[PDB]
Amino acid sequence: IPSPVREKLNRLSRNQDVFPILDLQELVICLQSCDFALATQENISRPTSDYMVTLYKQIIENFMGISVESLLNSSNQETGDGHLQEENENIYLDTLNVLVLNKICFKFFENIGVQDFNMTDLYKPEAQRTQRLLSAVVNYARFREERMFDCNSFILQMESLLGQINKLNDEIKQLQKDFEVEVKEIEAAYSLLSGHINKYMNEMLEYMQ
Amino acid sequence: ASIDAFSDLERRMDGFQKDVAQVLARQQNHVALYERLLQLRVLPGASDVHDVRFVFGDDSRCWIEVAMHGDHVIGNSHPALDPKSRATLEHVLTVQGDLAAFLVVARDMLLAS
Amino acid sequence: ARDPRPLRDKNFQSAIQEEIYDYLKKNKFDIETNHPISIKFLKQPTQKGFIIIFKWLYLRLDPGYGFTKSIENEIYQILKNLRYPFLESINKSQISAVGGSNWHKFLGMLHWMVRTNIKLDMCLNKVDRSLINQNTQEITILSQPLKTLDEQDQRQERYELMVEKLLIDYFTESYKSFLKLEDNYEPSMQELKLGFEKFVHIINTDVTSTELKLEELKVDLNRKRYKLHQQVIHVIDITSKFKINIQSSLENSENELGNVIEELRNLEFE
Amino acid sequence: NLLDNPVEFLKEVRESFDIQQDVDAMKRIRHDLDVIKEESEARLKLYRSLGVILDLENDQVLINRKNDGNIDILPLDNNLSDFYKTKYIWERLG
């Protein structure tokens, strides 16, 4: 008297894989069209480290709108830690940065259906994992592009309101520029005359002493 | 670019305007004036051997010419005068040697004649 | 490239075992895994218990990593990808039985991981604080009474940054529902509408602020111009009177002296 | 509310000065003083030697032909001078 089995806890694994896997040529065309010029079929098929590090940085800055430099900056708190004693060494640097980059990808991919991003994907990338991850990314980008018309009313309201600031700020800089020019050009007509008057009296004095 | 320093130039205007007034203070003729008050003018003589000619009155009614080079006693008069009037005037320039005395007396003789 | 720490020193091993045990008990090692922790165990360990500790620490550094069936064969590669600064100093032969004489080299690697974990939390706080800083972008420029920056439009680009931060939140959440075969994003949309009203109210502050500042520059320039104009009037008013009086003086002097010279040379009777 | 065009206004002031007119004027004024001075000089010493001294500082005329300063003065103000000043300036002489 045996009992059946629900294999499809792997449907949940397929569920973790709900986003579509894109063919190599289509995946790259879409990635390039998102203005990631660095992405190529050749490099992505044989991923190397220091290439993936550069390429990954470009991707994160676009979808997150942040500065990697600012990221390096925030890792190094200016004051408040360890200032009295150096402990004599520049070590831990970059190692912490490498794990922080790992975390950034991990959190993002959790949001788009990938739960197991890890250091191999960054530092010894492999073809199937690489295309799987990027296909989830593209599907997310397409969803964002596709659904971007949901927010156009907000954009239009924002553009109206931003227009009022700019129009008001344009008037302010125009008015403040025009008055300073007007003042000086009148003063030039007077400044010429002021030198003229000292000159006139000085010549007349030549024949009075 | 000049401004606000006008008080410096204002001082120059007020100073120069009044330096002008000092230099241009109206010098009086002192000769047109003296002739106007006294009806007495000093002109060169017609006969330049006798240098100085004196004209009395508003018109050419009375006049006389005198050398005034040294001991100047020259007889000459538009209203003719007797020798006695001419001798007294000739002594004031000779035995008195006073120009001022000779001048006041001469005009009295001429205007009355 | 060798590790400068004195791993072989036996005094150091005795000291840190007590210090390590206290930390391990506090962070629930003996509870999360059934394996108990003891000073004796940290004195000389078993290989089985070491892998439990290494995996527990590394998952705190790299939670998505999928460990293979025999962790010993990827520890070197893991350190290589991690850019472990002391990789050359660890020989591949002693990973087979770490509990032997060379346990000190592997205690120090584990200890270094603890220090990295400690430092990572500080890093995450700075990232979090950076999030706080991004929480500043939203609120720090707007709480300037008035800002100082080369582009009044840069405040604006910051405003756009403040706005864009809302859509990334909005679309990120909507995408989660889409992948769950869900299509209703009204929860996300209502939250976006409420946040945008805050924006409208706050950017309204700039419109109202800028309008009032603008009306004050108008009044001030008109009055300053009037004051400056009065300065011009005074110069022009007394300059002309100066010149005309001297023109009169010049004219008066010339007529004065011309008539005198005519009289001085008019020796006629007339 | 004022200064319809301050730029033209200032221009007129520079154009109303004219240096050469006044410089030319200065040449003529200095020349005229010399002509009056030089052609009055010989006569002016003759009138000075007469004893007739003139005060224009204080609007009166002094006479010093009696070896004293007690000779009565004649003011220059509020006067006819129409055979008026001349009578006084002939009766005070001797």
Side-chain angles (χ1 to χ4, degrees), chain A residues 1-9 18-209, chain B, chain C, chain D:
Chain A
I1 311 181
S3 37
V5 179
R6 274 201 141 81
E7 198 74 354
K8 283 316 101 163
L9 304 174
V18 173
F19 55 84
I21 313 301
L22 296 183
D23 293 325
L24 214 64
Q25 191 164 97
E26 183 192 1
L27 179 64
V28 166
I29 285 178
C30 298
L31 282 169
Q32 287 170 355
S33 299
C34 286
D35 211 12
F36 309 120
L38 199 69
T40 76
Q41 212 160 163
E42 199 187 52
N43 287 121
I44 281 157
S45 53
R46 271 75 176 181
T48 72
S49 196
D50 305 358
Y51 173 87
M52 296 312 312
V53 170
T54 309
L55 176 57
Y56 282 138
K57 286 211 260 169
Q58 195 180 349
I59 289 158
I60 284 158
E61 291 185 347
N62 189 243
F63 285 176
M64 289 174 63
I66 70 170
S67 174
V68 164
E69 181 53 305
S70 74
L71 289 196
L72 180 72
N73 282 2
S74 62
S75 65
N76 60 262
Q77 226 286 359
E78 272 193 0
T79 74
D81 42 5
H83 267 256
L84 302 183
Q85 304 85 2
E86 291 183 358
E87 293 172 358
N88 317 347
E89 206 29 68
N90 266 336
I91 299 304
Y92 300 97
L93 171 59
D94 278 5
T95 52
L96 289 173
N97 284 122
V98 157
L99 282 170
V100 163
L101 168 67
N102 195 52
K103 177 64 71 209
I104 292 148
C105 302
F106 182 81
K107 291 324 223 177
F108 166 78
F109 272 108
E110 277 186 323
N111 292 341
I112 59 162
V114 168
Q115 306 295 320
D116 67 329
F117 193 95
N118 64 85
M119 300 274 312
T120 295
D121 301 316
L122 280 174
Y123 293 108
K124 189 174 182 181
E126 48 204 41
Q128 296 309 295
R129 271 194 74 82
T130 302
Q131 78 160 350
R132 177 211 172 203
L133 301 183
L134 295 172
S135 280
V137 172
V138 170
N139 200 51
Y140 171 67
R142 299 179 141 151
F143 178 84
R144 189 179 179 90
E145 287 301 303
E146 174 172 50
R147 213 227 173 179
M148 180 65 78
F149 77 108
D150 291 336
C151 304
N152 276 336
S153 54
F154 302 119
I155 296 292
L156 292 203
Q157 196 162 6
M158 171 198 71
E159 292 175 342
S160 163
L161 287 159
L162 293 173
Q164 302 184 45
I165 298 309
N166 282 347
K167 167 153 152 173
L168 289 160
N169 267 321
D170 287 353
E171 274 186 55
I172 289 185
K173 61 183 85 185
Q174 187 80 328
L175 292 172
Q176 183 167 239
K177 142 183 174 181
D178 288 356
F179 184 75
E180 58 186 19
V181 161
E182 83 100 34
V183 162
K184 185 258 175 298
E185 66 97 24
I186 292 174
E187 170 178 42
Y190 167 86
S191 196
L192 213 64
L193 172 68
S194 77
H196 155 85
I197 299 179
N198 281 328
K199 182 179 176 180
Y200 173 73
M201 289 163 194
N202 295 333
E203 305 209 15
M204 296 292 277
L205 267 293
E206 189 186 26
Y207 303 78
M208 194 269 289
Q209 262 57 54
Chain B
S2 191
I3 187 60
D4 302 307
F6 175 65
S7 44
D8 291 354
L9 271 163
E10 175 162 20
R11 256 195 216 98
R12 271 199 166 270
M13 273 153 90
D14 186 293
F16 168 91
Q17 177 152 19
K18 306 301 175 183
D19 279 300
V20 168
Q22 287 305 315
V23 178
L24 304 182
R26 201 189 307 179
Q27 189 215 25
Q28 284 85 3
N29 199 146
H30 284 199
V31 165
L33 170 69
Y34 279 37
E35 295 164 356
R36 198 164 181 258
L37 282 195
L38 282 50
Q39 309 290 77
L40 172 64
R41 319 160 51 195
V42 188
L43 312 163
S47 307
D48 215 346
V49 190
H50 309 332
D51 275 324
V52 188
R53 163 189 288 212
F54 318 101
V55 179
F56 305 84
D58 180 84
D59 54 295
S60 158
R61 36 175 157 180
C62 319
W63 58 258
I64 180 167
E65 293 196 343
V66 190
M68 281 277 281
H69 192 44
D71 42 315
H72 51 88
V73 161
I74 310 193
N76 184 251
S77 62
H78 172 212
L81 313 168
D82 53 339
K84 163 191 171 182
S85 294
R86 284 179 91 265
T88 46
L89 285 185
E90 176 167 351
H91 281 48
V92 165
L93 280 190
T94 295
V95 309
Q96 188 147 345
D98 194 275
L99 262 292
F102 171 60
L103 294 162
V104 304
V105 167
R107 93 181 290 263
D108 286 318
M109 311 190 167
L110 276 174
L111 203 67
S113 313
Chain C
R2 292 156 175 164
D3 199 332
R5 305 180 290 172
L7 281 300
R8 320 261 196 187
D9 195 306
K10 300 303 154 165
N11 276 330
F12 181 78
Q13 299 191 13
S14 194
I16 71 180
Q17 273 153 354
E18 208 204 342
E19 291 196 12
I20 297 172
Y21 168 84
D22 282 331
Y23 191 78
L24 264 61
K25 198 85 172 60
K26 177 63 172 224
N27 293 272
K28 276 67 183 170
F29 160 84
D30 56 311
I31 299 90
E32 289 174 1
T33 181
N34 221 28
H35 190 318
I37 194 55
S38 68
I39 300 284
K40 190 175 163 153
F41 179 80
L42 301 154
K43 274 270 173 212
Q44 294 299 294
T46 76
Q47 189 85 9
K48 307 284 187 66
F50 164 85
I51 297 302
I52 299 175
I53 283 155
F54 178 83
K55 155 178 172 184
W56 183 84
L57 283 178
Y58 183 70
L59 289 190
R60 293 171 71 90
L61 310 181
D62 186 10
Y65 189 84
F67 270 111
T68 198
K69 284 66 59 176
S70 316
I71 287 189
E72 285 85 345
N73 312 114
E74 41 187 3
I75 283 174
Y76 189 93
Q77 184 74 44
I78 292 178
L79 299 158
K80 190 159 172 294
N81 302 340
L82 280 172
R83 286 167 82 52
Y84 187 59
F86 320 125
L87 187 60
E88 272 170 14
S89 83
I90 297 172
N91 185 237
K92 308 159 73 172
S93 49
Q94 285 303 320
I95 313 184
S96 306
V98 286
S101 72
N102 272 1
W103 167 237
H104 60 80
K105 299 173 150 165
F106 301 97
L107 197 61
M109 182 201 74
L110 280 185
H111 180 89
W112 174 88
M113 282 168 90
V114 168
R115 297 302 298 171
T116 300
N117 195 183
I118 289 175
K119 295 171 180 302
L120 177 52
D121 288 2
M122 304 162 178
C123 292
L124 299 178
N125 187 255
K126 303 145 191 276
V127 176
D128 284 359
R129 183 188 300 268
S130 182
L131 280 170
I132 300 175
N133 187 263
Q134 290 320 293
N135 279 236
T136 78
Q137 303 292 133
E138 294 279 34
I139 304 171
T140 205
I141 289 173
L142 293 148
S143 67
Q144 303 204 220
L146 169 56
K147 187 145 187 102
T148 71
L149 71 83
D150 73 323
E151 299 301 326
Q152 283 262 325
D153 56 80
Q154 208 279 7
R155 185 162 259 261
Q156 165 248 333
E157 297 172 359
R158 214 281 301 161
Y159 275 121
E160 298 173 319
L161 180 53
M162 180 178 70
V163 162
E164 182 174 349
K165 279 175 176 304
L166 289 175
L167 298 189
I168 288 175
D169 288 1
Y170 172 65
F171 276 111
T172 294
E173 279 319 302
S174 295
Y175 189 60
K176 279 175 193 178
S177 310
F178 173 85
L179 297 187
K180 290 177 174 83
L181 273 297
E182 286 149 28
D183 286 314
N184 188 24
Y185 313 136
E186 265 157 11
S188 308
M189 179 46 84
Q190 186 57 21
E191 204 163 322
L192 167 64
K193 278 181 187 176
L194 288 198
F196 193 79
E197 271 170 23
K198 306 289 185 66
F199 154 76
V200 172
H201 261 169
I202 182 64
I203 195 171
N204 272 340
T205 293
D206 282 9
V207 165
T208 296
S209 171
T210 303
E211 286 172 343
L212 293 172
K213 176 187 182 175
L214 164 77
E215 295 305 321
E216 196 49 42
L217 169 80
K218 289 180 191 168
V219 160
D220 186 59
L221 291 188
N222 286 345
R223 298 179 176 183
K224 287 183 185 289
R225 166 180 306 114
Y226 177 90
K227 265 202 186 295
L228 184 57
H229 280 206
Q230 298 297 118
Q231 266 181 292
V232 171
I233 304 299
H234 187 56
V235 160
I236 302 187
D237 167 71
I238 77 164
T239 288
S240 63
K241 180 169 184 176
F242 171 78
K243 191 48 154 56
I244 296 172
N245 274 354
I246 295 173
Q247 271 180 327
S248 172
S249 283
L250 290 170
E251 194 192 9
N252 284 339
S253 174
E254 207 171 8
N255 288 113
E256 276 158 11
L257 299 179
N259 297 129
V260 174
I261 292 177
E262 262 179 17
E263 289 294 345
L264 183 63
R265 296 179 174 162
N266 181 5
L267 309 180
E268 175 173 33
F269 293 128
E270 303 180 17
Chain D
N1 42 20
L2 61 93
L3 286 196
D4 283 318
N5 200 343
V7 177
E8 295 285 306
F9 287 153
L10 285 170
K11 182 183 304 178
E12 299 172 7
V13 183
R14 324 173 322 91
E15 295 187 334
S16 311
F17 258 106
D18 199 334
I19 285 160
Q20 206 57 28
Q21 77 183 213
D22 297 359
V23 165
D24 278 353
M26 154 78 77
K27 292 176 181 182
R28 305 200 300 274
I29 302 176
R30 64 195 291 98
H31 173 83
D32 295 345
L33 293 174
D34 296 9
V35 162
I36 296 160
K37 166 160 178 227
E38 75 197 5
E39 292 193 23
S40 305
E41 187 205 1
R43 268 171 287 188
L44 276 187
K45 188 180 290 192
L46 287 168
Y47 300 116
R48 187 176 89 193
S49 56
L50 272 167
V52 188
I53 295 299
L54 182 58
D55 165 27
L56 295 180
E57 180 80 19
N58 317 306
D59 274 310
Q60 308 294 126
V61 180
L62 303 150
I63 298 183
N64 201 15
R65 204 62 265 168
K66 293 293 169 304
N67 286 92
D68 70 321
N70 216 18
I71 312 183
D72 285 326
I73 58 184
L74 175 57
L76 320 173
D77 292 23
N78 311 315
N79 286 310
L80 265 177
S81 73
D82 304 334
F83 312 136
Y84 163 78
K85 299 203 183 184
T86 306
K87 210 173 179 175
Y88 206 93
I89 312 168
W90 275 119
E91 223 279 324
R92 302 314 126 195
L93 284 313

